[PDB]
Amino acid sequence: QISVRGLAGVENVTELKKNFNRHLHFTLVKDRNVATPRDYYFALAHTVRDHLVGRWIRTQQHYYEKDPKRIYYLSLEFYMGRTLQNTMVNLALENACDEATYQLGLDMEELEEIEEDAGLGNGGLGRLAACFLDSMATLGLAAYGYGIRYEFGIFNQKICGGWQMEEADDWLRYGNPWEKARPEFTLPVHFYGRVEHTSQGAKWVDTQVVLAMPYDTPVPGYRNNVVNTMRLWSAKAPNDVGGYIQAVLDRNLAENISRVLYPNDNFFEGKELRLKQEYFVVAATLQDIIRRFKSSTNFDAFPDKVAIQLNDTHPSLAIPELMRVLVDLERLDWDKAWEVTVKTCAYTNHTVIPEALERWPVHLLETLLPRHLQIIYEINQRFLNRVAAAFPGDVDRLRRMSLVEEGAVKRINMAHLCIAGSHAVNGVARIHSEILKKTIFKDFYELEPHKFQNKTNGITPRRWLVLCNPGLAEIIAERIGEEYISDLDQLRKLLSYVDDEAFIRDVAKVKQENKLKFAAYLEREYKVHINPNSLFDVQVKRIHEYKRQLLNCLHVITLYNRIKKEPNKFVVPRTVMIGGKAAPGYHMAKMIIKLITAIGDVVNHDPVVGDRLRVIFLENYRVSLAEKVIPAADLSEQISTAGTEASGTGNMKFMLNGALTIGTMDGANVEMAEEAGEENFFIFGMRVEDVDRLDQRGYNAQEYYDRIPELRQIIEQLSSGFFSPKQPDLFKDIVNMLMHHDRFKVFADYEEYVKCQERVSALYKNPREWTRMVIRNIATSGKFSSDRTIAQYAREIWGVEPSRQRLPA
Amino acid sequence: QISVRGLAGVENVTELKKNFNRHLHFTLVKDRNVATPRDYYFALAHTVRDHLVGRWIRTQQHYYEKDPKRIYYLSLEFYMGRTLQNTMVNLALENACDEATYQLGLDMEELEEIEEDAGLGNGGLGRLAACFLDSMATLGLAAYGYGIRYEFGIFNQKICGGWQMEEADDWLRYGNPWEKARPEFTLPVHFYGRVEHTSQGAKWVDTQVVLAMPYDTPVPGYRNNVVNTMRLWSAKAPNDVGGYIQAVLDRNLAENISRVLYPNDNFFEGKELRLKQEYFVVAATLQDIIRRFKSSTNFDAFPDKVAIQLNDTHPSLAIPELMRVLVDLERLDWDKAWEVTVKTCAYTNHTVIPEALERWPVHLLETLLPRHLQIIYEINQRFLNRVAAAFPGDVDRLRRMSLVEEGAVKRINMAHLCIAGSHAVNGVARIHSEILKKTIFKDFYELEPHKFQNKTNGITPRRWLVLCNPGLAEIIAERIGEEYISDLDQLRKLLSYVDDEAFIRDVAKVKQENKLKFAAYLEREYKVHINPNSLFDVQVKRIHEYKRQLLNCLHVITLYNRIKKEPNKFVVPRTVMIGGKAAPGYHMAKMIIKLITAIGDVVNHDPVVGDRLRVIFLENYRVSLAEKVIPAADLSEQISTAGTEASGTGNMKFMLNGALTIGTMDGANVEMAEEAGEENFFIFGMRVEDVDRLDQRGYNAQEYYDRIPELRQIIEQLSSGFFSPKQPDLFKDIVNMLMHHDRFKVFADYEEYVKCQERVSALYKNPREWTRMVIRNIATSGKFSSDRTIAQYAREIWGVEPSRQRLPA
Ligand SMILES: O=C(NC(=O)c1ccc([N+](=O)[O-])cc1)N[C@@H]1O[C@H](CO)[C@@H](O)[C@H](O)[C@H]1O
Ligand SMILES: O=C(NC(=O)c1ccc([N+](=O)[O-])cc1)N[C@@H]1O[C@H](CO)[C@@H](O)[C@H](O)[C@H]1O
Ligand SMILES: O=C(NC(=O)c1ccc([N+](=O)[O-])cc1)N[C@@H]1O[C@H](CO)[C@@H](O)[C@H](O)[C@H]1O
Ligand SMILES: O=C(NC(=O)c1ccc([N+](=O)[O-])cc1)N[C@@H]1O[C@H](CO)[C@@H](O)[C@H](O)[C@H]1O
Ligand SMILES: *Cc1c(COP(=O)(O)O)cnc(C)c1O
Ligand SMILES: *Cc1c(COP(=O)(O)O)cnc(C)c1O
């Protein structure tokens, strides 16, 4: 139907249909009379999976023959989403499968909705790992993603009585057709025990053993026939009546390590189970890496054949674990082992907020990983000796830079460990990387300037454009070809169409179709109609005070009060959509969700408002839902307090899909505005410097409350129970926080935000000009392709060259 | 190679080879360069499994169209063993697969050893269920086996320092290619809660819910194209940070229900988890049965379309559960519901030993299944009213027959419940069924004579002859054809070959080859040589005092002492093999295993003995091992105290495979001797009547110790530490038991046993006559085919006619 979805040749369609029927029969043990919708999805999944096999075997065989430098991306999160459509897209089988299933009397889009999301992540950090895997495969890098096969991913969110309820995400219930267990690579992981110092080196003994069984998932590159691997480890107890029965049941204790993903993305919690997960993935991965290295013994060449990227400090134990193996098992001298370690490891930081940084209590490491604690102390001693030599007499610096933090309970600062043991440390956006050098990592930057780099984030154009918005991808391709899908910078060619009446009309048509499509979805799976002609104002991302969904809420209430004040005045119709999950123990975040639904309960049922304003909370925001809502958005809300959002990636997804952005000069927003031109962006609020000035003199929210009548009215409504009749003081915690302890200065940006929003409404009233600005945004979103990001990591950190050359078959 | 293994046609072999390579590639994601032995096994398993699909779909479709009466065999145990070879045997693909794998350069027998046994049973009771499924499929009955999919079956047994060590049987670790999950049939099971009596009937509320997810395994009939189903239920928690994390981890509690098989086959233990397993299988199965019944509402015809067979009392809750559904949910009147229940249920008893009978504490049922306890009390009240009317004034009878036992803690006697709620109750051997009527069930027999029946056990000739002993099956087929494989009575035709010199020579040759084959296996997988020319004296079965492995031990020691007494006298060489697992908490059974190994440690290293006597303990006895050792045995030890072994089935396996039997007139041994002729059996010991006479006057072991010098010597050796130098009093518990509290009268049968064993040795010295007696045993083993047993259950209990007619394809 659509050319960017590939060819639907007769022989290919015929083959697909027969293999589909073959799997339904032999694999599913069903015939068209008793087959359930799920049976059909699995038959299709197997049929597509079959096309990956040859390429997967050939790719791995290829790496063995050429023996390239291998890239290992270690992450505790891989927010993959669904795999079926993405696989068809990268293999150019979408149209063929669509035709094949059509001929069999089935709707492929209906079958795609049956697949469960692989939600093995919380948000941005986990999704970045996913986009990176896609880009690394597309760029021909011998890359491996290593993580944990959680049997329960991020919880499914249910909204009950306006409150978030958490439900277990049993995503493996019906099976996962994409994974392949590799029992021959099962490896032992050690815990607890003690250290013995003998004549020849230290020895870690009396440990408890847990087995790590790997499951491999294929990662197909975009039409280059490359299929890389994502290997996830699953925990298994070693095999060696009340007592007997209990012993068997207690096996669950050991296997609980890979049971569930920790959902706290706001505050670090030093929980033992989480520490076990972190060591579990690191220990099994490093053994696998070393095995592959030896199967390709001087470790001097180890850094030339191995690159380990640490996604945040979560897998930071890789540093002392590599030292342990090299010193304790391989018997290399410390200095040489350290040289190898630093040269193979690199660390990526994702936030500057204190509460999110990992600082593990010493007593916990002491009990669980005694040898690693000793190695960490030794690393610290040698590092601090270097600091003392470079800054003689600077005693305060020694205290600040130590990997060991003193006080109540001694803790190990994992970020400091990562910097000391990595040859490269990077931020994820220009402004973020600069802040790292000026604030939290200043001392380290002064000691080792060369280590600090910037690698602005990106998103894959395949899942975030071709897959979720084929209509837009097609009108772009009709004019500039398909080459931009793997070379996004080519979108700049669209700048010469900004005045093309035909193109302007098509861009607007695609957006309208997406909105109608989403407006429908809303009614089918949920229960409310929305004016498809209203401006779709969307803010989707995890709920956090720093992301300021609260500021958005203040604007919504302002709009509502203005309508009530002058009912018969014309106002641009809006459908405000807010969605995202809140970490289970994050009280304020859960109160914000309740506030949003409470506002909707009032606004959506006010006769005077009509369909000029609607407030909808998008339930269970996840990758699959993002693929639906983003293409339908008109306005992207990226309003974090300047200096708090390291980069953001949702912002890039919206820009690539035809939405204009209203935001602060924070994270990647700065670079997006720079690429598109500030006149094509809706920028407002305090800049980082402004926030600093306010902190210097002290932030007093009362001042804003006293000087802004509209803000005062809103606060009084919240306090008096206007949005919670039956529970008058329901939102007292929110008002108290805003008035006395708001770390994110919501009131400080209120006035500029409301004024900026008025300018957005003004532009929406002029369809043609709104669309021309949209075109200017899409045309300059090329820099934000994760292919660009990965190419920079490859050349500037890993020391490998990207390849666009395809492979046999 | 061997005609009884089917044809190896060119087209069939060619097809098998290509499908094997197809699975290795697409299913295993491997090529002949990195494929592991396990990869090859799975490729073969999938290839064979593919041939089952069409027949499986057609069979179930067939039952829907014809809507025959369905037979439901409920069991907490299904001791299946391996599936690959059995499937090839029943589909006549053995030779073809053998040739196909051969051409690919692989040894099929080597690949078969990779499959894990499905050890979902303890012994005889669980294996009977397995043979029954095979026979029901072979006889064309619309039969379903229902049970639990334990993720851990019977423990693997390790012998350390002569002691049994238990190891978890993680049989699903590498996956099970034979099963197919059926998520569309997931059903809820209720626990705890309370009963509410409203205007219209009782209601069970506030219950905890656990989901039952079924997994189906195909059960192929012998070359009749019928493929029945064995459906096993797996427990799943319903889907609805410390608290959040713990809530997810606590899901294991609910899922623990299907985690492990209880290994106590000696003493009943009222454990809550076991009760949960029993209700879990019954609740899910009955809902499935009713669904299928409605999908084919007067339940008057329910008994005409449904038959439920209870394997022991383990699934006895089916009786009150069926009443619950009919009365509480379907709203039928009690009397009508009871009529339906009795007419559809039948109960099979497997032992008369008190300690093995299920007697659940009332307080346990009260908490876990409140409604069922109420239903049970009502059943009891109505039943006892019938008893009172039939035997007016007999107050003691009312106490004896009650389903409720008074005393320390009130308990529900499940056997009494089963008799009251079943239209048929059967023993498993003629002598056992008679004892039931004369002793433990006498009162019930007097009230309802028509309910009591006998159904002598049997074994399937396919796994127990064709599969494990192809050599013997072939020489038999060469002379009488292949028809006997599904009509075992035809073996009688062999009686006309007892004087055939050619046949006599072939029977002896086959046995010699099997012994050499097993003698080798012993050295390869274990570490000792054995004289292939010695008489193979074998006793394999679970370790129990009533089975008297101890009596066997006394004979071994006697033989050893006699050799030591007169070293230079000729004695027929023997290799005594004893094997079997002991229930984890069965102290005496574990001491018997230690004694056996201790005896071996002395006998096997005595220079004077040489290779005239060897004592070997066969480690990890299981179905797979039985298929190897039984065909190699010369002498089968079936020496339980008369009146204790209900039937025994291992005895039948040995008879069918060319071993002579030494045993007591117990269980099926009586019928085996009757079929073959007492002169062709080595019978010894007290008969049931003799044991009764001894109990009347009182058993005094001292009397035997004082009158038998050889026995006295043995006891003194055990007591003085002759078999445990470092631990002089190691076997004091055994000596104390034998001398003061032996419920099984080991000493009472000692003299006759030793004398009988001498006659066995005398016959072994005459090869030709030994073989002629063997032929007479094999020729009359036909009655012991489970096909005969099932045909009797079908006609006399279930009310259905067996069919030997094959099906399409
Ligand atoms: O577990 C399975 N069992 C069988 O396919 C099967 C087929 C035939 C027979 N048989 O007895 O003929 C038994 C099991 N199949 C599984 O069904 C899942 C859901 O579609 C797929 O994702 C898995 O890759 C597939 O192996
Ligand atoms: O998602 C993030 N972090 C987490 O999910 C997370 C996970 C665990 C913990 N923890 O404390 O355990 C804290 C945060 N960080 C996000 O990573 C994105 C990719 O670079 C950035 O663009 C965002 O600005 C950043 O907030
Ligand atoms: O889990 C499996 N995954 C795959 O076969 C597979 C194949 C190809 C790709 N792929 O990405 O191309 C991914 C997974 N296969 C499983 O391997 C087991 C052991 O042989 C079999 O018993 C199961 O029936 C089969 O489904
Ligand atoms: O195997 C048996 N019993 C058990 O495995 C068993 C299971 C559970 C409990 N329990 O108390 O829970 C007791 C015995 N019984 C055996 O069932 C065979 C088949 O009819 C008979 O031939 C044997 O004589 C009988 O001992
Ligand atoms: C892209 C994405 C994110 C990150 O969004 P930000 O606004 O950068 O925080 C989070 N969740 C999902 C499901 C995503 O697709
Ligand atoms: C046949 C069999 C049994 C039963 O043996 P008996 O001697 O009747 O107790 C037990 N275990 C296995 C593995 C069997 O094959």
- DSSP readout, A595-624? HHHHHHHHHTT-TTTTTSEEEEEETT--HH
Cross-strand bridge partners of residue A327:
none
What distance in Å separates the CA atoms of residue B699 and residue B701, rounded to the nearest whole number? 6
Going from the C-alpha of B760 to that of each of A248, B573, B634, B754, the distances in angstroms are 45, 12, 10, 10
**Close Cβ partners of B540 (under 8 Å, ≥ 6 residues apart):** B577, B578, B579, B580, B618, B621, B625, B626, B629, B630, B650
CB of residue A790 inside a 6 A radius of ligand 5: no
Selecting among A149, A231, A350, A372, the annotated active-site residue is A350
Contact B750, B551 (CB under 8 A): yes
- Give the pairing of strands A345-348 and A143-148: unpaired
Nearest Cα residue to B581 out of B29, B299, B163, B134: B163
End-to-end C-alpha distance for chain B, whole angstroms: 25
What distance in Å separates the CA atoms of residue B139 and residue A82, rounded to the nearest whole number? 47
What distance in Å separates the CA atoms of residue B528 and residue B600, rounded to the nearest whole number? 12
End-to-end C-alpha distance for chain A, whole angstroms: 25
**Close Cβ partners of B723 (under 8 Å, ≥ 6 residues apart):** B595, B598, B599, B601, B602, B717, B730, B731
A267 is known to lie in a ligand binding site:
no
The secondary structure of chain A in percent helix, strand, coil, rounded to multiples of 5, reads: 55, 15, 30
What distance in Å separates the CA atoms of residue B480 and residue B212, rounded to the nearest whole number? 48
* Atom 22 in ligand 3: residue holding the nearest Cα: B177
What distance in Å separates the CA atoms of residue A312 and residue A278, rounded to the nearest whole number? 12
Structure tokens at A589: 């975040």
- CB atoms inside a 10 Å sphere around CB B726: 6
Nearest Cα residue to A117 out of A626, A618, A580: A626
- 3-state SS, B719-754, equals HHCCCCCCCCCCCHHHHHHHHHCCCCCCHHHHHHHH
Contact residues, chain B, for A211 at CB < 8 Å: none
What distance in Å separates the CA atoms of residue B774 and residue B499, rounded to the nearest whole number? 12
Q: What is the DSSP letter of A421?
A: T
Q: What is the DSSP letter of A557?
A: H
With vertex at residue B293, the alpha carbon angle to CA B287 and CA B297, rounded to the nearest 5 degrees, is: 100
**Close Cβ partners of A665 (under 8 Å, ≥ 6 residues apart):** A431, A642, A673, A683, A685, A687, A688
Candidates A227, A241, A295: best to mutate against B (most CBs of B within 10 A) is: A241
Chain breaks in chain A following residues, C–N > 2.5 Å:
240, 296
Structure tokens at B510: 């086959």
Cross-strand bridge partners of residue B345:
B308
Beta strands in B523-630 (DSSP E): 535-540, 574-579, 613-618
Nearest Cα residue to B556 out of B629, B625, B631, B635: B635
Three-state secondary structure call for residue A690: helix
- 3-state SS, B483-537, equals HHHHCHHHHHHHHHHCCCHHHHHHHHHHHHHHHHHHHHHHHHHCCCCCCCCCEEE
Q: Can A644 be counted among the known catalytic residues?
A: no
With vertex at residue A244, the alpha carbon angle to CA B234 and CA B231, rounded to the nearest 5 degrees, is: 20
Q: Could you give the angle at which helices B10-22 and B94-103 cross, rounded to 10 degrees?
A: 60
Cross-strand bridge partners of residue A72:
A144, A308
Burial label for B46, CB within 10 Å (0-12, 13-18, 19+), is: buried
Beta strands in A60-116 (DSSP E): 70-74, 78-81
Burial label for B523, CB within 10 Å (0-12, 13-18, 19+), is: exposed
Check if A53 contacts B (Cβ < 8 Å). Answer: yes
Contact A244 B269 (CB under 8 A): no
Contact B585 A244 (CB under 8 A): yes
Nearest Cα residue to A151 out of B260, B251, B256: B251
What distance in Å separates the CA atoms of residue A2 and residue A95, rounded to the nearest whole number? 7
Contact B244 A166 (CB under 8 A): yes
Contact B8, B96 (CB under 8 A): yes
Q: DSSP string of A225-236?
A: --EEEEEEEEEE
Residue A510: its H or E element: helix A501-525
Nearest Cα residue to B29 out of A80, A27, A60: A60
Shortest alpha-carbon distance between residue B262 and chain A (Å):
7
CATH fold for domain A459-785: Rossmann fold (3.40.50)
Contact A140, A802 (CB under 8 A): yes
What distance in Å separates the CA atoms of residue B137 and residue B222, rounded to the nearest whole number? 8
Contact B258, B189 (CB under 8 A): no
Nearest Cα residue to B212 out of B180, B189, B231, B191: B189
Burial label for B456, CB within 10 Å (0-12, 13-18, 19+), is: buried
Amino acid at B589: A
Burial label for B569, CB within 10 Å (0-12, 13-18, 19+), is: exposed
The full length of chain B comes to 809
Residue B453: its H or E element: strand B452-454
CB of residue A123 inside a 6 A radius of ligand 2: yes
Q: What is the resolution of this structure in A?
A: 1.9
Q: Can A783 be counted among the known catalytic residues?
A: no
Beta strands in A404-556 (DSSP E): 404-405, 411-413, 424-427, 452-454, 535-540
How many Å separate Cα A702 from the centre of its chain?
36
What distance in Å separates the CA atoms of residue A233 and residue A215, rounded to the nearest whole number? 6
Residue of A29, A243, A260 lying closest to B56 (CB–CB): A29
Counting runs of H as helices and runs of E as strands, what totals does chain B give? 32, 25
With tokens 């003194």, the residue in question is B716
What distance in Å separates the CA atoms of residue B321 and residue B72, rounded to the nearest whole number? 15
What distance in Å separates the CA atoms of residue A134 and residue A220, rounded to the nearest whole number? 7
- CA–centroid distance, residue A789 to ligand 6 (Å): 66
CA nearest A153 in B: which residue?
A: B248
* Atom 4 in ligand 2: residue holding the nearest Cα: A265
Contact B170 A583 (CB under 8 A): no
Burial label for A354, CB within 10 Å (0-12, 13-18, 19+), is: exposed
Nearest Cα residue to A781 out of A472, A533, A508: A472
Per-domain residue ranges of chain B: 1-458+786-806, 459-785
Amino acid at B549: Q
The atom number, within ligand 5, closest to the CA of A638 reads: 7
Q: Can A541 be counted among the known catalytic residues?
A: yes
Check if B295 contacts A (Cβ < 8 Å). Answer: no
CB of residue A622 inside a 6 A radius of ligand 5: yes
Contact B631, B475 (CB under 8 A): no
Q: What is the DSSP letter of A199?
A: S
Contact residues, B window 164-183, toward A, CB-based 8 Å cutoff: 166-168, 170, 173-175, 180-181, 183
Cα R_g (chain A), whole angstroms: 27
- 3-state SS, A366-385, equals HHHCHHHHHHHHHHHHHHHH
What distance in Å separates the CA atoms of residue A124 and residue A641, rounded to the nearest whole number? 17
Contact B232, B214 (CB under 8 A): yes
With tokens 């229960």, the residue in question is A527
Check if B160 contacts A (Cβ < 8 Å). Answer: no
What sign has the CA pseudo-torsion A601, A603, A608, A612?
A: negative
Structure tokens at B295: 């999908």
With tokens 């001694």, the residue in question is A410
Edge to edge, what strands does the sheet with B411-413 contain? Answer: B359-361, B411-413, B404-405
Nearest Cα residue to A317 out of A367, A360, A268: A360
Question: Annotated binding site of B for AMP, which residues?
Answer: 31, 64, 291-296
What sign has the CA pseudo-torsion A661, A664, A667, A671?
A: positive
Shortest alpha-carbon distance between residue B53 and chain A (Å):
6
What sign has the CA pseudo-torsion B139, B145, B151, B152?
A: negative
With tokens 């009365």, the residue in question is B327
Nearest Cα residue to B640 out of B353, B223, B240, B237: B353
What distance in Å separates the CA atoms of residue B243 and residue B249, rounded to the nearest whole number? 10
**Close Cβ partners of A766 (under 8 Å, ≥ 6 residues apart):** none
Structure tokens at A680: 């094509």
Nearest Cα residue to A164 out of A588, A746, A527, A732: A588
CB of residue A153 inside a 6 A radius of ligand 5: no
Contact residues, chain A, for B237 at CB < 8 Å: 168
CB of residue A600 inside a 6 A radius of ligand 2: no
Structure tokens at B532: 């292939």
- CB atoms inside a 10 Å sphere around CB A766: 11
Q: Can A547 be counted among the known catalytic residues?
A: yes
Selecting among A455, A547, A548, A783, the annotated active-site residue is A547
Cα R_g (chain B), whole angstroms: 27
| Domain pair B1-458+786-806 / B459-785, same fold | yes
Contact B180 A249 (CB under 8 A): no
- CATH architecture of the domain formed by B1-458+786-806: 3-Layer(aba) Sandwich (3.40)
Q: What stretches of A630-784 show up as alpha helix (H) in DSSP?
A: 650-656, 669-676, 688-697, 701-707, 709-720, 732-740, 750-764, 767-779
- Give the pairing of strands B202-205 and B194-197: antiparallel
Going from the C-alpha of A19 to that of each of A13, A14, A46, A51, A103, the distances in angstroms are 10, 9, 9, 11, 14
The full length of chain A comes to 809
What sign has the CA pseudo-torsion A422, A428, A430, A432?
A: negative
- CA–centroid distance, residue A646 to ligand 2 (Å): 9
Three-state secondary structure call for residue B145: strand
Residue of B170, B180, B241 lying closest to A584 (CB–CB): B241
Contact B157, B123 (CB under 8 A): no
Q: Which ligand ends up closest to the CA of B175?
A: 3
- CB atoms inside a 10 Å sphere around CB A635: 22
Candidates A19, A27, A29, A213: best to mutate against B (most CBs of B within 10 A) is: A29
Check if B272 contacts A (Cβ < 8 Å). Answer: no
Q: Could you give the angle at which helices B587-603 and B732-740 cross, rounded to 10 degrees?
A: 110
What distance in Å separates the CA atoms of residue B72 and residue B144, rounded to the nearest whole number? 5
Going from the C-alpha of B307 to that of each of A803, B78, B136, B143, B286, the distances in angstroms are 68, 19, 13, 9, 11
Contact B361, B410 (CB under 8 A): yes
With tokens 């190897």, the residue in question is B628
Structure tokens at A420: 């000391």
- CB atoms inside a 10 Å sphere around CB B759: 12
Contact residues, chain B, for A180 at CB < 8 Å: 29
Nearest Cα residue to B712 out of B576, B557, B599: B557
Nearest Cα residue to B144 out of B258, B52, B84, B226: B226
Ligand 2 pocket test, pick from A128, A260, A265 with the greatest ligand atom count within 8 Å of Cβ, gives A265
Contact B403, B383 (CB under 8 A): yes
Chain breaks in chain B following residues, C–N > 2.5 Å:
240, 296
What distance in Å separates the CA atoms of residue B709 and residue B573, rounded to the nearest whole number? 24
Q: Over the range A381-417, which residues count as b (16 or more CB within 10 Å of their CB) and which as e?
A: eebbeebeeebeeeeebbeebbbbbeeeeebbbbbbb
Contact B125, B311 (CB under 8 A): yes
B98: left (phi over 0), alpha (psi -120 to 50) or beta: alpha
**Close Cβ partners of A496 (under 8 Å, ≥ 6 residues apart):** none
Per the entry, the structure determination technique was X-ray
Three-state secondary structure call for residue A182: coil
Structure tokens at B321: 């559960």
Contact B671, B771 (CB under 8 A): no
Contact B201, B216 (CB under 8 A): no
Residue A749: what are its φ and ψ, rounded to 5°? -105, 0
